Amino acid sequence: MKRTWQPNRRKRAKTHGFRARMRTPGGRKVLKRRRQKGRWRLTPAVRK
Amino acid sequence: AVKKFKPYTPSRRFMTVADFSEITKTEPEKSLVKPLKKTGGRNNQGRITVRFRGGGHKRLYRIIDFKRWDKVGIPAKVAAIEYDPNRSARIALLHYVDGEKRYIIAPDGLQVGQQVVAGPDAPIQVGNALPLRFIPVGTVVHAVELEPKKGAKLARAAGTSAQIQGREGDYVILRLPSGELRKVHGECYATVGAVGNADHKNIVLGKAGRSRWLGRRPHVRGAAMNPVDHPHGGGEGRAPRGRPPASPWGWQTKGLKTRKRRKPSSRFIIARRKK
RNA sequence: GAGCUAGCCCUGGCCAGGGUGAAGCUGGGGUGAGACCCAGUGGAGGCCCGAACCGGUGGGGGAUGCAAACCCCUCGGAUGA
RNA sequence: GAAUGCCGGCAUGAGUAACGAUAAAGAGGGUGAGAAUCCCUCUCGCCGUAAGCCCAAGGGUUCCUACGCAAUGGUCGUCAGCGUAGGGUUAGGCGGGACCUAAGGUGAAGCCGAAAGGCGUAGCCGAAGGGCAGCCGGUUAAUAUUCCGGCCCUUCCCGCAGGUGCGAUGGGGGGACGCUCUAGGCUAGGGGGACCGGAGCCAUGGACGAGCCCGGCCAGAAGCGCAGGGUGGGAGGUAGGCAAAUCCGCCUCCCAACAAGCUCUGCGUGGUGGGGAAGCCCGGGUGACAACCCCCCGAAGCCAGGGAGCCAAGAAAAGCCUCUAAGCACAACCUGCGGGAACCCGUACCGCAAACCGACACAGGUGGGCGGGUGCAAGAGCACUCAGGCGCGCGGGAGAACCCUCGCCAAGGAACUCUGCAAGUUGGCCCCGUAACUUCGGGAGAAGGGGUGCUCCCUGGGGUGAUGAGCCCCGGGGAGCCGCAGUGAACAGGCUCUGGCGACUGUUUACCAAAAACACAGCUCUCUGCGAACUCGUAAGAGGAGGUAUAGGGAGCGACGCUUGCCCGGUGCCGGAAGGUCAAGGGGAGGGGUGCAAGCCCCGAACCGAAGCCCCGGUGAACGGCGGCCGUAACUAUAACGGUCCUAAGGUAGCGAAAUUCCUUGUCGGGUAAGUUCCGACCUGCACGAAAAGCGUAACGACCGGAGCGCUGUCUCGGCGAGGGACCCGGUGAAAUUGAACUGGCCGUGAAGAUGCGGCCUACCCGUGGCAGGACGAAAAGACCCCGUGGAGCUUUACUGCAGCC
RNA sequence: CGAUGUCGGCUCGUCGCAUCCUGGGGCUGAAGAAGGUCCCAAGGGUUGGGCUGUUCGCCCAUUAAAGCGGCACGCGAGCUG
RNA sequence: UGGGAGAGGGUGGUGGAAUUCCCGGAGUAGCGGUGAAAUGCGCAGAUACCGGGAGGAACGCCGAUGGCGAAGGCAGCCACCUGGUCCACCCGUGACGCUGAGGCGCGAAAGCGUGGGGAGCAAACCGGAUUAGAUACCCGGGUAGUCCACGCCCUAAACG
RNA sequence: CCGAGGGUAGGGCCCGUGACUGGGGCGAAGUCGUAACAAGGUAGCUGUACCGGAAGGUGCGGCUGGAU
Ligand SMILES: [Mg+2]
Ligand SMILES: [Mg+2]
Ligand SMILES: [Mg+2]
Ligand SMILES: [Mg+2]
Ligand SMILES: [Mg+2]
Ligand SMILES: [Mg+2]
Ligand SMILES: [Mg+2]
Ligand SMILES: [Mg+2]
Ligand SMILES: [Mg+2]
Ligand SMILES: [Mg+2]
Ligand SMILES: [Mg+2]
Ligand SMILES: [Mg+2]
Ligand SMILES: [Mg+2]
Ligand SMILES: [Mg+2]
Ligand SMILES: [Mg+2]
Ligand SMILES: [Mg+2]
Ligand SMILES: [Mg+2]
Ligand SMILES: [Mg+2]
Ligand SMILES: [Mg+2]
Ligand SMILES: [Mg+2]
Ligand SMILES: [Mg+2]
Ligand SMILES: [Mg+2]
Ligand SMILES: [Mg+2]
Ligand SMILES: [Mg+2]
Ligand SMILES: [Mg+2]
Ligand SMILES: [Mg+2]
Ligand SMILES: [Mg+2]
Ligand SMILES: [Mg+2]
Ligand SMILES: [Mg+2]
Ligand SMILES: [Mg+2]
Ligand SMILES: [Mg+2]
Ligand SMILES: [Mg+2]
Ligand SMILES: [Mg+2]
Ligand SMILES: [Mg+2]
Ligand SMILES: [Mg+2]
Ligand SMILES: [Mg+2]
Ligand SMILES: [Mg+2]
Ligand SMILES: [Mg+2]
Ligand SMILES: [Mg+2]
Ligand SMILES: [Mg+2]
Ligand SMILES: [Mg+2]
Ligand SMILES: [Mg+2]
Ligand SMILES: [Mg+2]
Ligand SMILES: [Mg+2]
Ligand SMILES: [Mg+2]
Ligand SMILES: [Mg+2]
Ligand SMILES: [Mg+2]
Ligand SMILES: [Mg+2]
Ligand SMILES: [Mg+2]
Ligand SMILES: [Mg+2]
Ligand SMILES: [Mg+2]
Ligand SMILES: [Mg+2]
Ligand SMILES: [Mg+2]
Ligand SMILES: [Mg+2]
Ligand SMILES: [Mg+2]
Ligand SMILES: [Mg+2]
Ligand SMILES: [Mg+2]
Ligand SMILES: [Mg+2]
Ligand SMILES: [Mg+2]
Ligand SMILES: [Mg+2]
Ligand SMILES: [Mg+2]
Ligand SMILES: [Mg+2]
Ligand SMILES: [Mg+2]
Ligand SMILES: [Mg+2]
Ligand SMILES: [Mg+2]
Ligand SMILES: [Mg+2]
Ligand SMILES: [Mg+2]
Ligand SMILES: [Mg+2]
Ligand SMILES: [Mg+2]
Ligand SMILES: [Mg+2]
Ligand SMILES: [Mg+2]
Ligand SMILES: [Mg+2]
Ligand SMILES: [Mg+2]
Ligand SMILES: [Mg+2]
Ligand SMILES: [Mg+2]
Ligand SMILES: [Mg+2]
Ligand SMILES: [Mg+2]
Ligand SMILES: [Mg+2]
Ligand SMILES: [Mg+2]
Ligand SMILES: [Mg+2]
Ligand SMILES: [Mg+2]
Ligand SMILES: [Mg+2]
Ligand SMILES: [Mg+2]
Ligand SMILES: [Mg+2]
Ligand SMILES: [Mg+2]
Ligand SMILES: [Mg+2]
Ligand SMILES: [Mg+2]
Ligand SMILES: [Mg+2]
Ligand SMILES: [Mg+2]
Ligand SMILES: [Mg+2]
Ligand SMILES: [Mg+2]
Ligand SMILES: [Mg+2]
Ligand SMILES: [Mg+2]
Ligand SMILES: [Mg+2]
Ligand SMILES: [Mg+2]
Ligand SMILES: [Mg+2]
Ligand SMILES: [Mg+2]
Ligand SMILES: [Mg+2]
Ligand SMILES: [Mg+2]
Ligand SMILES: [Mg+2]
Ligand SMILES: [Mg+2]
Ligand SMILES: [Mg+2]
Ligand SMILES: [Mg+2]
Ligand SMILES: [Mg+2]
Ligand SMILES: [Mg+2]
Ligand SMILES: [Mg+2]
Ligand SMILES: [Mg+2]
Ligand SMILES: [Mg+2]
Ligand SMILES: [Mg+2]
Ligand SMILES: [Mg+2]
Ligand SMILES: [Mg+2]
Ligand SMILES: [Mg+2]
Ligand SMILES: [Mg+2]
Ligand SMILES: [Mg+2]
Ligand SMILES: [Mg+2]
Ligand SMILES: [Mg+2]
Ligand SMILES: [Mg+2]
Ligand SMILES: [Mg+2]
Ligand SMILES: [Mg+2]
Ligand SMILES: [Mg+2]
Ligand SMILES: [Mg+2]
Ligand SMILES: [Mg+2]
Ligand SMILES: [Mg+2]
Ligand SMILES: [Mg+2]
Ligand SMILES: [Mg+2]
Ligand SMILES: [Mg+2]
Ligand SMILES: [Mg+2]
Ligand SMILES: [Mg+2]
Ligand SMILES: [Mg+2]
Ligand SMILES: [Mg+2]
Ligand SMILES: [Mg+2]
Ligand SMILES: [Mg+2]
Ligand SMILES: [Mg+2]
Ligand SMILES: [Mg+2]
Ligand SMILES: [Mg+2]
Ligand SMILES: [Mg+2]
Ligand SMILES: [Mg+2]
Ligand SMILES: [Mg+2]
Ligand SMILES: [Mg+2]
Ligand SMILES: [Mg+2]
Ligand SMILES: [Mg+2]
Ligand SMILES: [Mg+2]
Ligand SMILES: [Mg+2]
Ligand SMILES: [Mg+2]
Ligand SMILES: [Mg+2]
Ligand SMILES: [Mg+2]
Ligand SMILES: [Mg+2]
Ligand SMILES: [Mg+2]
Ligand SMILES: [Mg+2]
Ligand SMILES: [Mg+2]
Ligand SMILES: [Mg+2]
Ligand SMILES: [Mg+2]
Ligand SMILES: [Mg+2]
Ligand SMILES: [Mg+2]
Ligand SMILES: [Mg+2]
Ligand SMILES: [Mg+2]
Ligand SMILES: [Mg+2]
Ligand SMILES: [Mg+2]
Ligand SMILES: [Mg+2]
Ligand SMILES: [Mg+2]
Ligand SMILES: [Mg+2]
Ligand SMILES: [Mg+2]
Ligand SMILES: [Mg+2]
Ligand SMILES: [Mg+2]
Ligand SMILES: [Mg+2]
Ligand SMILES: [Mg+2]
Ligand SMILES: [Mg+2]
Ligand SMILES: [Mg+2]
Ligand SMILES: [Mg+2]
Ligand SMILES: [Mg+2]
Ligand SMILES: [Mg+2]
Ligand SMILES: [Mg+2]
Ligand SMILES: [Mg+2]
Ligand SMILES: [Mg+2]
Ligand SMILES: [Mg+2]
Ligand SMILES: [Mg+2]
Ligand SMILES: [Mg+2]
Ligand SMILES: [Mg+2]
Ligand SMILES: [Mg+2]
Ligand SMILES: [Mg+2]
Ligand SMILES: [Mg+2]
Ligand SMILES: [Mg+2]
Ligand SMILES: [Mg+2]
Ligand SMILES: [Mg+2]
Ligand SMILES: [Mg+2]
Ligand SMILES: [Mg+2]
Ligand SMILES: [Mg+2]
Ligand SMILES: [Mg+2]
Ligand SMILES: [Mg+2]
Ligand SMILES: [Mg+2]
Ligand SMILES: [Mg+2]
Ligand SMILES: [Mg+2]
Ligand SMILES: [Mg+2]
Ligand SMILES: [Mg+2]
Ligand SMILES: [Mg+2]
Ligand SMILES: [Mg+2]
Ligand SMILES: [Mg+2]
Ligand SMILES: [Mg+2]
Ligand SMILES: [Mg+2]
Ligand SMILES: [Mg+2]
Ligand SMILES: [Mg+2]
Ligand SMILES: [Mg+2]
Ligand SMILES: [Mg+2]
Ligand SMILES: [Mg+2]
Ligand SMILES: [Mg+2]
Ligand SMILES: [Mg+2]
Ligand SMILES: [Mg+2]
Ligand SMILES: [Mg+2]
Ligand SMILES: [Mg+2]
Ligand SMILES: [Mg+2]
Ligand SMILES: [Mg+2]
Ligand SMILES: [Mg+2]
Ligand SMILES: [Mg+2]
Ligand SMILES: [Mg+2]
Ligand SMILES: [Mg+2]
Ligand SMILES: [Mg+2]
Ligand SMILES: [Mg+2]
Ligand SMILES: [Mg+2]
Ligand SMILES: [Mg+2]
Ligand SMILES: [Mg+2]
Ligand SMILES: [Mg+2]
Ligand SMILES: [Mg+2]
Ligand SMILES: [Mg+2]
Ligand SMILES: [Mg+2]
Ligand SMILES: [Mg+2]
Ligand SMILES: [Mg+2]
Ligand SMILES: [Mg+2]
Ligand SMILES: [Mg+2]
Ligand SMILES: [Mg+2]
Ligand SMILES: [Mg+2]
Ligand SMILES: [Mg+2]
Ligand SMILES: [Mg+2]
Ligand SMILES: [Mg+2]
Ligand SMILES: [Mg+2]
Ligand SMILES: [Mg+2]
Ligand SMILES: [Mg+2]
Ligand SMILES: [Mg+2]
Ligand SMILES: [Mg+2]
Ligand SMILES: [Mg+2]
Ligand SMILES: [Mg+2]
Ligand SMILES: [Mg+2]
Ligand SMILES: [Mg+2]
Ligand SMILES: [Mg+2]
Ligand SMILES: [Mg+2]
Ligand SMILES: [Mg+2]
Ligand SMILES: [Mg+2]
Ligand SMILES: [Mg+2]
Ligand SMILES: [Mg+2]
Ligand SMILES: [Mg+2]
Ligand SMILES: [Mg+2]
Ligand SMILES: [Mg+2]
Ligand SMILES: [Mg+2]
Ligand SMILES: [Mg+2]
Ligand SMILES: [Mg+2]
Ligand SMILES: [Mg+2]
Ligand SMILES: [Mg+2]
Ligand SMILES: [Mg+2]
Ligand SMILES: [Mg+2]
Ligand SMILES: [Mg+2]
Ligand SMILES: [Mg+2]
Ligand SMILES: [Mg+2]
Ligand SMILES: [Mg+2]
Ligand SMILES: [Mg+2]
Ligand SMILES: [Mg+2]
Ligand SMILES: [Mg+2]
């Protein structure tokens, strides 16, 4: 049947993307946390 | 003259539609329409604030002239009477001798080709708008401003009217559609006549699909829900109210008065509605 | 976190074919005028039969599955909420 | 040494289950160390409204070629979506951007919030909507509306020429719109041809033929022809379109008006440019100077912004046209021609799937377009087939039980069983014909029946055409033929009677309930006069509603029919300028502390003092409630009648052993041979009853009862047969579980149900196919129950607070 | 209670005997026939249907008879539900 | 042809008296009601009185033993639309007449449907009296209805 | 071919019968009240409507076949 992952590049970038994260106090804490943890990707990859 | 149907489906047994005889023009004035933004009952938070709304037919809004003291003295010709889906009344398209064109609520017995005008001097004929002080006592009236220059607010729904009962100082006294007796300032404009399309209240929707066309989504009895949802929710089997009948929010809904006590407009309400 | 699901908003798309034959209209009859009757025309409807499409009624299978809800048969809706 | 401990390793189950749709394979020839599995050929089977072809999303080199086979591939592998390497995606016209706006988002102005932040007209962003210029063919191993060929086109810059009051983010027009039905004429696509072109073929009894088989087109600028769309023209007045305006609007006049004219599409033609089969030969070559013509069917597409009817009344902005303002009129703009200029990103491949979403090369899920032919009344249904694509990445044998899916069955026909569950029966079209009841629509496909193929003959109308022929679509009559059987295969209702519930179509517990539940039109109560009530928010601000009592919120009831009784003492809500109570505050009789005193400080009675509550009324489609005992009639029985206690009032109409009845299978009647169910009655209703509505109701229901007819493998009562498994051989190879095991029966014993203790009995060692009585077999630290001064959801006249309101 | 699945039915049996029938007896208020009562006896047999989930029971039609109990109210790693 | 009388019918207007309610004023201990009472209303200021307002229904006198209509029935006033009827003249048509099974129309009240209206009255219903009882008569309340528009019902001691 | 009839299926009319139920007629001396006849002690009757153990009562309109 229809599963829960229906990928969509626009949806991905507008929801989890770098700019959406920066527009919001919580999103900026996410970026700061993942930078502190040394993540290689701060934000999901999506082709655009 | 509400139209019936033969019972050739279960719903057509009871369905009645308006007869649309008074309508003379089937498309609106392009310079007077604008898009009506449907809300689904949601506010600027996206939250539902009025339940069971949405999904009705697309509508264009017709700009209506609820001032008419806008063009004092300038007479106009009644060009067309049209359907308006944003209100129960029909609307009349006016061609002013100016060249300006405008919609008003169509009063009862207004005729295509007659002339209307507004102002302190206007004749006391159906379709004309005067300050209330210049309309004689006893006159049936609609489209009444409630405060000078603020716009027609009262008696606008199909079939409704106010009647002038008397004068007192700067105020006249109206019997509103609801039977209330209320002082309205003498400078408020009002249009002579009652609103038209009075058979509107005799329409039998006939089926659930019809309410859906009007943007009305099904209404759920609180007694059909659970206690997380509603005071009347829950109970094994069917259940009476078991408490004073209440709203989803807990306040009582059989008699509890709700008009604000210390409201300044009280000094102008002579007698509350009845019947 | 509403890329699942629920509701709503905007903008597009889709619904083989067959059947039934409302109003109205025209004519004929009818009457003082009528109501009305009849035939033709007409093509209405949360109308009917049925694919797509949307469902999931009953039974059987499957039960370390092909599948963490599937398969076969059968069955509901299919111009409409 | 134990923690259902943690991490890792390795066992057991076991050469066991399985190897992923039952669309299906066989052979010959190649390659190679190795071949059922790779390649080639022939034969066979499957899909063909796809299992074919083309877009979009998503995926991200999986594409093509060469070389490989350790791992990945459920077997094998020489093969591959795998490993290594190289190559491959070419645009002014396709899509997106340098254009427009939708919801929504963001947001100068402005508003609000302890901070973070929340709003917010404009404006800006935002598309699968608007707008905008490219079609046919050829070429590559792999791209192509992109390269090439041919024929067309758009914008920008500069110039020349002609023309004009030129000029705008400002005014106006237009853009600009629903649903259903639909006309004319076309195109796509399709059918036939005794005509045109073609390699050929004559088989096995016949045919050298009007034979068979194959093909008979595509693109095209101006011009022209056909069919459509769009649009009145001139003048005068003018106060409206937030300046102006010759534009638009309004008024008047004249002419033109099923027209015309102008303008714009579609189709046809069209210079020209292409393509071009079977067969044979080796993707190529021939065929071939290929032919490219006629008739018919014909769209859901095109003309289109077409027409009609209807109510639920159907986006915006730009492009574009017109108007004028600054300005400028040497400019500028319009038209025509010429030269020059024309950027960025995508383009490979998969794409109903082995490349996307499902951990897998997973019977699941995934939006748009094309989707041929014949017959079956039609169709995208069904059967078979074209083009094209496949045989589903383990095989080979065997022909047990048993399982699955399927076929048939003597006599009987529901005797099966909780239940006709399941499976039969019926089954399309045409004609005949059709009951109670009804809201007059219906019930209805009621029921029940007859017809149905082929051949010859005569014949009716419609479309094409010409009015004919031919083609084409529906038929009508007659005479015959064959079989068991003519919707001869596939697709395609079993029917009736009678109850309960819900009026109805709808909706629901994704993934154990689809229902009698929810919704529903309709009815009633009640709130609300608009800065409405109500809802969300601390607020600002929103929704309500650009609505206004024929409207909006809340509640119950639930089409419709006939109706909805009595009780206001308690609770609720409504009304009540009195009285009682009542907080802060006012007031200050009268005290107290200290100081020498002036004073400073503290306590404080009366009285005045809101809402609320008390109190007085009202109110049931507000919460709710609607009795007991005893007596009595000239047979008896039973009580119309009476007495008395009590209550706020004592249940009315209707209905009743009920979706409600405990005693209960009440009693009687019906149906049956027989009926705890069913139906009809009765009424001592444990414990119906009137909008948590009462009693009925045509039609409707995958709802739940009861009955009958039809028919059956449901059954008496089982038998046979088919395929896929099970079984044997080759390849690959799991799982839960498991203290260790050298693991029998009885009668006893034992923590009370013993392979393991006692006494008897029985028993050579080890497997394979089977069955499930036991190992208190597995699974899941029982979800029932209790316990914990454990948790959570929910309620209220529990407690105590809070928002909100007064 | 770190699970001993719980009614009835179906299927399949097997056992006890306080015996329903068949076989052998004593007494009889046993004339015969047919019974009653008790003793011995477990070899075999002990039907089909209507009602209800029913066990049981009642009823219909038969029969030689239509026995009563146990086996975790025998039997859900056998089925049903 | 010329005149007449009339509550004949339909539509639109409109006038005054009275009741009820509301507002203001003035005033105080009862009002109401009956056979008698009570229930009820009233110091939260009723009744009685004055002024203002709202609303519905019916039209006093004239009015009659009257008039008109086929019947049912029709009554303030005004206008419009409209029917029946009588009288005069003796003008026109030339038996064109009577009745009338069916049919069709009208048809008091009550009642029914959908809206609207609601002052007074008042089935049902509540209360107070009476009574052996009093599901009545009397008294205090009171809902349909009575009123309007449209559509039904079609009865009557619809009687002379 | 027609055809007595027989079979199937569905309608129509009539007769008999049916748990139970509805009222009706009749029947020497039953129970409850007293509605009508006199102004019958509320004049009666009337059509309709609602209500009540019962006769009846009340509303609306009508009749005199009402009395003083
Ligand atoms: Mg889903
Ligand atoms: Mg999605
Ligand atoms: Mg995307
Ligand atoms: Mg997207
Ligand atoms: Mg998105
Ligand atoms: Mg976001
Ligand atoms: Mg982002
Ligand atoms: Mg911050
Ligand atoms: Mg990572
Ligand atoms: Mg890095
Ligand atoms: Mg992130
Ligand atoms: Mg109707
Ligand atoms: Mg009808
Ligand atoms: Mg109208
Ligand atoms: Mg516009
Ligand atoms: Mg917003
Ligand atoms: Mg709401
Ligand atoms: Mg809503
Ligand atoms: Mg409205
Ligand atoms: Mg309207
Ligand atoms: Mg005012
Ligand atoms: Mg209404
Ligand atoms: Mg609407
Ligand atoms: Mg509603
Ligand atoms: Mg509801
Ligand atoms: Mg509930
Ligand atoms: Mg519930
Ligand atoms: Mg919640
Ligand atoms: Mg709560
Ligand atoms: Mg609650
Ligand atoms: Mg409750
Ligand atoms: Mg409940
Ligand atoms: Mg209950
Ligand atoms: Mg419930
Ligand atoms: Mg309760
Ligand atoms: Mg409450
Ligand atoms: Mg009011
Ligand atoms: Mg979603
Ligand atoms: Mg998605
Ligand atoms: Mg459809
Ligand atoms: Mg048909
Ligand atoms: Mg027809
Ligand atoms: Mg028409
Ligand atoms: Mg339908
Ligand atoms: Mg049909
Ligand atoms: Mg089945
Ligand atoms: Mg499962
Ligand atoms: Mg399936
Ligand atoms: Mg199927
Ligand atoms: Mg259907
Ligand atoms: Mg359809
Ligand atoms: Mg230890
Ligand atoms: Mg473990
Ligand atoms: Mg542990
Ligand atoms: Mg351990
Ligand atoms: Mg571990
Ligand atoms: Mg290791
Ligand atoms: Mg381990
Ligand atoms: Mg290992
Ligand atoms: Mg192992
Ligand atoms: Mg092993
Ligand atoms: Mg083996
Ligand atoms: Mg084994
Ligand atoms: Mg396995
Ligand atoms: Mg497997
Ligand atoms: Mg299959
Ligand atoms: Mg082979
Ligand atoms: Mg091989
Ligand atoms: Mg090999
Ligand atoms: Mg193979
Ligand atoms: Mg090959
Ligand atoms: Mg071969
Ligand atoms: Mg096909
Ligand atoms: Mg991937
Ligand atoms: Mg390998
Ligand atoms: Mg290998
Ligand atoms: Mg290697
Ligand atoms: Mg492998
Ligand atoms: Mg391998
Ligand atoms: Mg695999
Ligand atoms: Mg090799
Ligand atoms: Mg490539
Ligand atoms: Mg190009
Ligand atoms: Mg640029
Ligand atoms: Mg923009
Ligand atoms: Mg954006
Ligand atoms: Mg776009
Ligand atoms: Mg383009
Ligand atoms: Mg082109
Ligand atoms: Mg190409
Ligand atoms: Mg210009
Ligand atoms: Mg438009
Ligand atoms: Mg528009
Ligand atoms: Mg659009
Ligand atoms: Mg519509
Ligand atoms: Mg073409
Ligand atoms: Mg064809
Ligand atoms: Mg030969
Ligand atoms: Mg030849
Ligand atoms: Mg001007
Ligand atoms: Mg060729
Ligand atoms: Mg050549
Ligand atoms: Mg289409
Ligand atoms: Mg369509
Ligand atoms: Mg179009
Ligand atoms: Mg059109
Ligand atoms: Mg806009
Ligand atoms: Mg110059
Ligand atoms: Mg120009
Ligand atoms: Mg650039
Ligand atoms: Mg690029
Ligand atoms: Mg490409
Ligand atoms: Mg699929
Ligand atoms: Mg597709
Ligand atoms: Mg593939
Ligand atoms: Mg997942
Ligand atoms: Mg595979
Ligand atoms: Mg798959
Ligand atoms: Mg073809
Ligand atoms: Mg067919
Ligand atoms: Mg295969
Ligand atoms: Mg397949
Ligand atoms: Mg396979
Ligand atoms: Mg074998
Ligand atoms: Mg199969
Ligand atoms: Mg067969
Ligand atoms: Mg056979
Ligand atoms: Mg048989
Ligand atoms: Mg039978
Ligand atoms: Mg039979
Ligand atoms: Mg049966
Ligand atoms: Mg069942
Ligand atoms: Mg069958
Ligand atoms: Mg069939
Ligand atoms: Mg019948
Ligand atoms: Mg019938
Ligand atoms: Mg029937
Ligand atoms: Mg019936
Ligand atoms: Mg009928
Ligand atoms: Mg039939
Ligand atoms: Mg037949
Ligand atoms: Mg025939
Ligand atoms: Mg034949
Ligand atoms: Mg024969
Ligand atoms: Mg069928
Ligand atoms: Mg239901
Ligand atoms: Mg239903
Ligand atoms: Mg019901
Ligand atoms: Mg109903
Ligand atoms: Mg439906
Ligand atoms: Mg479920
Ligand atoms: Mg669930
Ligand atoms: Mg679930
Ligand atoms: Mg299920
Ligand atoms: Mg359920
Ligand atoms: Mg259903
Ligand atoms: Mg529900
Ligand atoms: Mg319903
Ligand atoms: Mg109702
Ligand atoms: Mg109402
Ligand atoms: Mg709030
Ligand atoms: Mg705050
Ligand atoms: Mg709004
Ligand atoms: Mg608004
Ligand atoms: Mg409901
Ligand atoms: Mg309900
Ligand atoms: Mg209903
Ligand atoms: Mg009825
Ligand atoms: Mg009460
Ligand atoms: Mg009270
Ligand atoms: Mg109370
Ligand atoms: Mg107070
Ligand atoms: Mg209670
Ligand atoms: Mg109570
Ligand atoms: Mg009653
Ligand atoms: Mg009973
Ligand atoms: Mg019942
Ligand atoms: Mg009960
Ligand atoms: Mg019982
Ligand atoms: Mg019982
Ligand atoms: Mg019985
Ligand atoms: Mg019987
Ligand atoms: Mg009884
Ligand atoms: Mg209730
Ligand atoms: Mg209930
Ligand atoms: Mg009922
Ligand atoms: Mg019914
Ligand atoms: Mg019914
Ligand atoms: Mg249903
Ligand atoms: Mg159902
Ligand atoms: Mg049954
Ligand atoms: Mg049956
Ligand atoms: Mg039967
Ligand atoms: Mg069998
Ligand atoms: Mg076999
Ligand atoms: Mg062997
Ligand atoms: Mg092996
Ligand atoms: Mg392997
Ligand atoms: Mg050991
Ligand atoms: Mg050992
Ligand atoms: Mg052993
Ligand atoms: Mg042993
Ligand atoms: Mg023991
Ligand atoms: Mg033992
Ligand atoms: Mg042993
Ligand atoms: Mg030992
Ligand atoms: Mg020992
Ligand atoms: Mg031992
Ligand atoms: Mg031993
Ligand atoms: Mg032994
Ligand atoms: Mg073996
Ligand atoms: Mg074995
Ligand atoms: Mg076992
Ligand atoms: Mg077992
Ligand atoms: Mg066991
Ligand atoms: Mg154990
Ligand atoms: Mg066990
Ligand atoms: Mg488990
Ligand atoms: Mg635990
Ligand atoms: Mg435990
Ligand atoms: Mg536990
Ligand atoms: Mg547990
Ligand atoms: Mg549970
Ligand atoms: Mg316990
Ligand atoms: Mg405690
Ligand atoms: Mg404790
Ligand atoms: Mg606790
Ligand atoms: Mg808690
Ligand atoms: Mg707080
Ligand atoms: Mg509130
Ligand atoms: Mg336990
Ligand atoms: Mg365990
Ligand atoms: Mg366990
Ligand atoms: Mg059985
Ligand atoms: Mg003897
Ligand atoms: Mg004897
Ligand atoms: Mg024996
Ligand atoms: Mg039994
Ligand atoms: Mg038992
Ligand atoms: Mg029993
Ligand atoms: Mg036993
Ligand atoms: Mg025992
Ligand atoms: Mg026991
Ligand atoms: Mg027991
Ligand atoms: Mg058992
Ligand atoms: Mg089981
Ligand atoms: Mg069992
Ligand atoms: Mg077991
Ligand atoms: Mg076991
Ligand atoms: Mg069950
Ligand atoms: Mg006083
Ligand atoms: Mg007093
Ligand atoms: Mg009033
Ligand atoms: Mg004469
Ligand atoms: Mg009448
Ligand atoms: Mg009347
Ligand atoms: Mg007395
Ligand atoms: Mg008389
Ligand atoms: Mg015979
Ligand atoms: Mg009397
Ligand atoms: Mg008397
Ligand atoms: Mg009397
Ligand atoms: Mg008397
Ligand atoms: Mg009475
Ligand atoms: Mg009279």
From Swiss-Prot, chain A:
Gene3D superfamilies: 1.10.287.3980
GO biological process terms, semicolon-separated: translation
Keyword Magnesium: no
An example Gene Ontology CC term for this record: ribonucleoprotein complex
Keyword annotations of the record: Ribonucleoprotein, Ribosomal protein
Biased composition (Basic residues): 29-48
Keyword DNA damage part of the UniProt annotation: no
Region ranges (Disordered): 26-48
InterPro entries membership: Ribosomal_bL34, Ribosomal_bL34_CS
GO molecular function, one term: structural constituent of ribosome
Known function: Found on the solvent side of the large subunit.
Record's miscellaneous remark: The open reading frame (ORF) for this protein is entirely within the ORF for the RNase P protein (RnaP). The two start codons are separated by four nucleotides.
Similarity-based family: Belongs to the bacterial ribosomal protein bL34 family.
Assembly and oligomerization: Part of the 50S ribosomal subunit.
Name of the protein in question: Large ribosomal subunit protein bL34
Native species: Thermus thermophilus (strain ATCC 27634 / DSM 579 / HB8)
Gene name of the encoded protein: rpmH
UniProtKB/Swiss-Prot annotation, chain B:
Keyword Transcription regulation in annotation: no
Pfam family membership, one: Ribosomal_L2_C
SUPFAM superfamilies from the UniProt entry: Nucleic acid-binding proteins, Translation proteins SH3-like domain
GO biological process, alphabetically ordered: cytoplasmic translation
Family: Belongs to the universal ribosomal protein uL2 family.
NCBIfam families tied to this protein: rplB_bact (TIGR01171)
Subunit structure: Part of the 50S ribosomal subunit. Forms a bridge to the 30S subunit in the 70S ribosome, contacting the 16S rRNA. May also make transient contacts with protein S6 during translation in the 70S ribosome.
Protein's UniProt name: Large ribosomal subunit protein uL2
Naturally occurring in which organism (per UniProt): Thermus thermophilus (strain ATCC 27634 / DSM 579 / HB8)
Lineage of the species this protein comes from: Bacteria, Thermotogati, Deinococcota, Deinococci, Thermales
Gene name tied to this protein: rplB
